[PDB]
Amino acid sequence: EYKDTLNLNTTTFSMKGNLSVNEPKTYAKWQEQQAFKRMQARKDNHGDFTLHDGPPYANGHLHLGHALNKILKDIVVKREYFKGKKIYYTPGWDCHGLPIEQQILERLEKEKTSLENPTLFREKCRDHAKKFLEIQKNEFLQLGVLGDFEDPYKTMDFKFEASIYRALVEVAKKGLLKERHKPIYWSYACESALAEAEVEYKMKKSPSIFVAFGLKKESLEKLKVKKASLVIWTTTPWTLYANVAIALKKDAVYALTQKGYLVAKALHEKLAALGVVDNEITHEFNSNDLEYLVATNPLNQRDSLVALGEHVGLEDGTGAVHTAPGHGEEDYYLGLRYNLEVLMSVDEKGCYDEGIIHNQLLDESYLGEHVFKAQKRIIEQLGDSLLLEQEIEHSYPHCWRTHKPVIYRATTQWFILMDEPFIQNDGSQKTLREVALDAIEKVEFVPSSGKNRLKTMIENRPDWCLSRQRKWGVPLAFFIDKRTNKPCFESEVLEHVANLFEKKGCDVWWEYSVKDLLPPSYQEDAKHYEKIMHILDVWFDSGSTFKAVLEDYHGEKGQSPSDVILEGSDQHRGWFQSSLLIGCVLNNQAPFKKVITHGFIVDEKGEKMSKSKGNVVSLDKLLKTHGSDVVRLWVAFNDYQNDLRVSQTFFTQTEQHYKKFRNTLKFLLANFSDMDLKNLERPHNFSPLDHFMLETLETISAGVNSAFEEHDFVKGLNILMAFVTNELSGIYLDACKDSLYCDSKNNEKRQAIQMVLLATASKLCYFLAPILTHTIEEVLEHSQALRIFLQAKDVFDLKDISVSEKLHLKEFKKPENFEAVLALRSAFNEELDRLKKEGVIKNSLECAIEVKEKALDENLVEELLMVSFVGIAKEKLSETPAFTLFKAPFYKCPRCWRFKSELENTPCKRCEQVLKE
Ligand SMILES: CC[C@H](C)[C@H](N)C(=O)OP(=O)(O)OC[C@H]1O[C@@H](n2cnc3c(N)ncnc32)[C@H](O)[C@@H]1O
Ligand SMILES: [Zn+2]
Secondary structure: OOHHHOOOOOOOOOOOOOHHHHHHHHHHHHHHOOHHHHHHHOOOOOOEEEEOOOOOEOOOOOOHHHHHHHHHHHHHHHHHHHHOOEEEOOOEEEOOOHHHHHHHHHHHHHOOOOOOOHHHHHHHHHHHHHHHHHHHHHHHHOOOOOOOOOOOEEOOOHHHHHHHHHHHHHHHHOOOEEEEEEEEEEEOOOOEEOOHHHEEEEEEEEEEEEEEEEEOHHHHHHHOOOOOEEEEEEOOHHHHHHOOEEEEEOOOEEEEEOOOEEEEHHHHHHHHHHOOOOOOEEEEEEHHHHOOOEEEOOOOOOEEEEEEEOOOOOOOOOOEEEEOHHHOHHHHHHHHHOOOOOOOOEOOOOEEOOHHHHOOOOOHHHOOOEHHHHHHHHHHHOHHHEEEEEEEEEEEEEEOOOOOEOEEEEEEEEEEOOOOOEEOOOOOEEOHHHHHHHHHOOOEEEOOHHHHHHHHHHHHOOOEEOEEOOOOOOEOOOEEEOOOOEEOOOHHHHHHHHHHHHHHOOHHHHHOOOHHHOOHHHHHHHHHEEEOOOEEOHHHHHHOHHHHHHHOOOOOOOOOOEOEEEEEHHHOOOHHHHHHHHHHHHOOOOOEOEEEEEOOEEOOOOOOOOOOOOOOOOHHHHHHHHOHHHHHHHHHOOOOOOOEEOOHHHHHHHHHHHHHHHHHHHHHHHHHOOOOHHHHHOOOOOOHHHHHHHHHHHHHHHHHHHHHHOOOHHHHHHHHHHHHHHHHHHHHHHHHHHHHHHOOOOOHHHHHHHHHHHHHHHHHHHHHOOOOHHHHHHHHHOOHHHHHHOOOOOHHHOOOOOHHHHOOOOOOOOOOOOHHHHHHHHHHHHHHHHHHHHOOOOOHHHEEEEEOOOOOOHHHHHHHHOOOEEOOOOOEEEEOOOEEEEEOOOEOOOOOOOOOEOOOOOOOHHHHHHHHO
């Protein structure tokens, strides 16, 4: 009957998050109130921070990977904002290319329709990108992220298309944009060249065959043998029609078997065990003496030159390599080395064309057949020359959006050259590969291992094929002079076109005549010029975002180079590399100072998610079930630099952490809710325990901050959680509960406790604000004391505070040392544990302790162990080397339940006083 005489100590801040209901209201408010613009306009901004957004493709709804990405960017940006900086973060969308165009192509199929008008086709692509840009923008905002989402950048904006073109212009004028004719990746499904970032290597089954090419009569006579046939190994019977040579290893021994097969001696043992060749060797020859002999192709009876390759391998195959210059890059260079024909009779759709008849390379029945469908019939046609057929599996390149296997076709395309010296901005001379490698060494990678991934790619990469044979993209908008057969790179022409794109967009390249695309100076010679109609690799679009966004807006959307970029691990093959290369051409450095890489969302078994496999976890369902602040906490509280597995068990762990933080903030708010805000002006006498908590708060705050500075949010959250769980809840709040609930509101020691709780909630708000922004906004909404103490209207006014200044602490105050008393506490609690299960007592408050160590502050002992008496009493309960435990020789107080009453059912002296107030 004393419960209503206690301090109420409640807050309107609720235990339950109600996140599905409350979070949309917060995020809608931030949109309506233009919170991001308010952040940028903050009057006392000091220093600048630029995160340059890498642009997601404007196709589809968001998945959990996009959420991971944008949430990490948001934590990084909000950290810098709350450190006091002016922030720049303009999100963007990647609107061109097959990620958009393939969806139009597939829908036209399903509807059984076609769209051949270029302007109308580009319009359907553009409308699709516009549609999903808005969908994605709103789904991003539902995660609580803040950026310039009402003014995002778009690669389909006319000014951006011009910026991309002007970047290409800079490459051309530095001498790095050149035509090459060679075999390259070819996607037959979309009738386009491809480069590396547009291929996905996947396991594929293939025929694997060993084929005898008999030496011609005159070559047998020169070699002085009766029978000899070189054996080749190939997995592509579809290229045998284009054979012109058989390449051997230089200065290497070739064995001739009794049945007359000629293979590398080093491989004969393996080949005979396979049954490709017979076991007996009759003669050995040096490949140097075999060069310029001639064999016969069993498929079509054509000559095949015996040639010497560069670096022919002896781990695979036979040591004799079927050479088809039209369908292999190294083959092509060998063919030119020996002035051989480049046979290439495979069209843009991957089908054999009339060249096989004109050149007598393959039977006419194959005309129009797809090369992969023809292979079975080709293999059957080989007859006795087929020595062995297997089926193998190997990693094979596939088109990134049609998912069909690619082939290689000799073709003329446009490239950025990697090993071509060009004039540096400082006047020196270096190749792009050299510049990029030097640039990488100036970039910080998080984790540092990511440097090695990008560096190895730059060390090994080939020339970058830029030209694509689709319509949705930025054209390589140069004219060829027919009088010279070379491109026109005159600045007046290039600037004229760039200005037209900036005002009208690239549709004009298809619509306008050559004369109408030329400056008036040139229009009389318009008859001599023809347009290049190829469009740029979409990876060149996105590689140019630093120029189009950071440079062309002169710092208004962030500096070049950016301070941070942050993307998934596939962007070393992608956007990190394209942006590095273009930045090194234009600026001779990377357009970013730091690269943070995150892993991929994968299922509970570590496997990739796909609608095909049935293992896709829905972002919308995840948000509905847990709320965005829980999804955000899951991101921050996990090892995001490696792949992240999604499962109910891991989200249940995160929910328990969120509940612990939330329940802690509720308790804090409840227990300084009644404090007279005049307290905030005056200093207080703090107890040793108070000081221990303030000093501990400062030590853990430094550790959290250092961890968050290194982007190790797990480490920082673990420090914060341990403080919340152990020192705060376990030690301080337990020890303070009596004063908080049972001491007078005027009690100066209670007021000091409340100031410690205020300072503690203040630091929790500051450190959690980048991660749980909605929840900290809610905390401030419900606590007038915090808003006054922090001079904060809302979460966007938070700053790191000096607890020392706010609480008026003395400069040279010597820290508490609690090692001895906390060791006594743990030892007492272990002994109390044992007495409880024996039934000897129920609670620490029933006990008296006499400590043999006279050196300890006895009131601190009583405070920390929550005994009701320090000293000697009558009934001995137990004894250790450090202390003796007795039953407290008092009654339980009916108001505070401490054993401090001299009379049964009578308020103790403290409570008596409080009740009389
Ligand atoms: C930087 C984007 C470039 C230019 C390109 N448009 C692109 O890849 O766009 P998108 O495919 O939509 O991806 C945009 C960003 O999401 C990241 N991402 C994609 N899938 C996943 C996934 N399962 N798990 C985690 N992250 C993912 C990707 O790593 C990039 O950080
Ligand atoms: Zn009492």
